[PDB]
């Protein structure tokens, strides 16, 4: 009532494309416990790296690393299907417990992070200034990650549907789609959003037949 223990900065993890995803917001009062279910980036992915982050930048690398740990033992599955529940729990003593749990296998790994870890009083004020200073740039980085992840979904989903479609797809549509996927995959290697979007545009324009078959099944 005259003081609050608060988090001066956001806490969370690295997600696909090197984004800091927040679990406990800035200026949250302790104690607190937030959880969020995530999944695998890759088919038949057997493990996840939980990279614990402090700060307000959208790029994971522009934030303070509080440590990392692995959860192993993820049974073969398509990407996006496993349920990995991540829990950030800060107690009365100011200690952060991060758990990751495979909701299928029951398996769990934690890291514990001293109240004293992370950025000191300067570096916080500094970190805040950079967040406000780089709101534009961080926003542009977010949009390229989102675009990359939309491009890769279109990529990976179109390949599946081609395999699922076999002889249904007129060879002439296959040729055009295969060339667009090769070109989209190439563009996703790069940093030019416009070009990713252009290969996505091209894929949609040659796939209209593939999409009918897929819907039908």
């Amino acid at each position: 009532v005259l003081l609050l223990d608060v988090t001066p900065l956001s806490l969370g993890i690295e997600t696909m494309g090197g984004v800091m995803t927040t679990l406990i917001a800035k200026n949250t009062t302790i104690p607190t416990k937030h959880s969020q279910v995530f999944s695998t980036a890759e088919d038949n992915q057997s493990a996840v790296t939980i990279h614990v982050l402090q700060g307000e930048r959208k790029r994971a690398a522009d934030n303070k690393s509080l440590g990392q740990f692995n959860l192993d033992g993820i049974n073969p599955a398509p990407r996006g299907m496993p349920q990995i529940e991540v829990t950030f729990d800060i107690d009365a003593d100011g200690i952060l417990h991060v758990s990751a749990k495979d909701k299928n296998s029951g398996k769990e790994q934690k890291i514990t992070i001293k109240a004293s870890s992370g950025l000191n009083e300067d570096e916080i004020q500094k970190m805040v200034r950079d967040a406000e200073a780089n709101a534009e740039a961080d926003r542009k980085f977010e949009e390229l990650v989102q675009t990359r992840n939309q491009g890769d979904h279109l990529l990976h989903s179109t390949r599946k549907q081609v395999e699922e479609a076999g002889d249904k797809l007129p060879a002439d549509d296959k040729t055009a789609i295969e060339s667009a996927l090769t070109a989209l995959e190439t563009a996703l290697k790069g940093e030019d959003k416009a070009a990713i979007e252009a290969k996505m545009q091209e894929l949609a324009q040659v796939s209209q037949k593939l999409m009918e078959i897929a819907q039908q099944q």
């Binding site: 696909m16 992915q45 790296t49």
Partner: peptide
């Protein structure tokens, strides 16, 4: 949302 290895 997805995590890499």
């Amino acid at each position: 949302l997805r995590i890499a290895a």
